Design an enzyme around this catalytic site. Sequence first.
Site, PDB file in Angstrom:
ATOM      1  N   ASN A   1      52.515  -5.767 -55.701  1.00 28.42           N
ATOM      2  CA  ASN A   1      51.780  -5.343 -56.891  1.00 28.42           C
ATOM      3  C   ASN A   1      52.467  -6.097 -58.048  1.00 28.42           C
ATOM      4  O   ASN A   1      53.565  -5.715 -58.463  1.00 28.42           O
ATOM      5  CB  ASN A   1      51.884  -3.826 -57.081  1.00 28.42           C
ATOM      6  CG  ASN A   1      50.900  -3.257 -58.077  1.00 28.42           C
ATOM      7  OD1 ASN A   1      50.836  -3.660 -59.247  1.00 28.42           O
ATOM      8  ND2 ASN A   1      50.120  -2.283 -57.641  1.00 28.42           N
TER       9      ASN A   1
ATOM     10  N   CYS B   1      43.987  -6.321 -59.719  1.00 27.97           N
ATOM     11  CA  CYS B   1      42.865  -5.506 -59.246  1.00 27.97           C
ATOM     12  C   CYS B   1      42.535  -5.790 -57.760  1.00 27.97           C
ATOM     13  O   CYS B   1      43.389  -5.654 -56.876  1.00 27.97           O
ATOM     14  CB  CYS B   1      41.631  -5.686 -60.139  1.00 27.97           C
ATOM     15  SG  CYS B   1      41.909  -5.374 -61.907  1.00 27.97           S
TER      16      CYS B   1
ATOM     17  N   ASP C   1      47.088  -0.817 -48.544  1.00 31.33           N
ATOM     18  CA  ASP C   1      47.397  -0.387 -49.903  1.00 31.33           C
ATOM     19  C   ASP C   1      48.590  -1.202 -50.391  1.00 31.33           C
ATOM     20  O   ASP C   1      49.739  -0.842 -50.118  1.00 31.33           O
ATOM     21  CB  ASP C   1      47.675   1.133 -49.937  1.00 31.33           C
ATOM     22  CG  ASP C   1      47.932   1.717 -51.313  1.00 31.33           C
ATOM     23  OD1 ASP C   1      47.649   1.028 -52.316  1.00 31.33           O
ATOM     24  OD2 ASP C   1      48.407   2.868 -51.386  1.00 31.33           O
TER      25      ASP C   1
ATOM     26  N   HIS D   1      42.569   2.013 -59.010  1.00 30.20           N
ATOM     27  CA  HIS D   1      43.418   1.607 -57.882  1.00 30.20           C
ATOM     28  C   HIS D   1      42.556   0.993 -56.772  1.00 30.20           C
ATOM     29  O   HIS D   1      41.576   1.607 -56.338  1.00 30.20           O
ATOM     30  CB  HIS D   1      44.285   2.769 -57.364  1.00 30.20           C
ATOM     31  CG  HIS D   1      45.299   2.369 -56.331  1.00 30.20           C
ATOM     32  ND1 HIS D   1      46.267   1.411 -56.594  1.00 30.20           N
ATOM     33  CD2 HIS D   1      45.486   2.839 -55.077  1.00 30.20           C
ATOM     34  CE1 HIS D   1      46.990   1.318 -55.490  1.00 30.20           C
ATOM     35  NE2 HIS D   1      46.564   2.162 -54.554  1.00 30.20           N
TER      36      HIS D   1
END
Length: 329
Positions: free
Chosen positions: A9, A14, A264, A247
């Site tokens: 991240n 996005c 994720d 998210h």
Amino acid sequence: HTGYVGLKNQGATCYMNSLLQTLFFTNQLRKAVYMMPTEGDDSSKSVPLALQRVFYELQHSDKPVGTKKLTKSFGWETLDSFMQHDVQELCRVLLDNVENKMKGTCVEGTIPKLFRGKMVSYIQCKEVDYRSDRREDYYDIQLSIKGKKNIFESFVDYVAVEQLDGDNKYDAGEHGLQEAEKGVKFLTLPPVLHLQLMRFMIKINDRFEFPEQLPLDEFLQKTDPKDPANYILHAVLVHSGDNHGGHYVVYLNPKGDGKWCKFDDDVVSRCTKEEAIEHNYGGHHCTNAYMLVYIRESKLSEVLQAVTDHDIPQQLVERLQEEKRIEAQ
Ligand SMILES: CCc1c(-c2ccc3[nH]ncc3c2)cnc(N)c1-c1ccc(O)cc1
């Protein structure tokens, strides 16, 4: 435990991490991306070389992969650069660079081979005997979700006839302003089907169903008995939000075997079919699919062909290993 690694991240990227795992698990495109002639390229300016690095790292690294060199190469480095655009724009830009870099090579035309579908846009006049048939090429399908309960209904609405009446009458040229019917008809569907669900025009969160198996033969003009248009759900690109605090996560069954994983960012964990499909329908919490990836049953084995260390050229390995050595200092 999954056997797959995640991505870091590193900002308001996005959908970027979600698309990267989507394209990486499009094994035929991955192999093709490795065959690109990037030896003479610049380690900072080259987008195709940056896409190879991420793909190599995802295939070997046990640690979460970095995307800093990728974001720099295509110039999306501003605070809200990804927020100003969509996943469809990022994919179009990324795949235009890898297909452009494939010209002259043995692996030239990988993108049209996997993503090109054949369409026909028509305008038939009611009172006049004039028809304007415009054969078009498509690489994805933008499906409207508002009002529609499922993919079938979205496809029904997509192929539905529009009425060109009164104020919005059709310029039939020599026949003047004529009342006509406008529609689209599917000629062929690509081996890799990318379906953009028009949730973002504002963000619509209404319940929208998609199957694991999608029969699309009934939407084609002519059907092949030896090759039906049966599609297998491969990826489910998900988003959690309303207007703010978004998210992005992606669900994939990389082998097409129905054994799903939740991707994720840096955390890759095995999930049920329910978590990947049914739970991302939306309605009622706030979680839903914005983009879907289906692979044709007949092309499943070729698209998802096994990729090994030997499928990566030595010249590529040598360069990325040297880059790892420099950063290790
Ligand atoms: C294949 C990428 C592409 C191109 C495109 C770009 C470069 C190309 N080179 N050759 C054919 C070709 C097509 C044109 N229009 C699009 N809508 C898309 C697209 C597909 C899937 C997505 O999830 C998002 C976008």
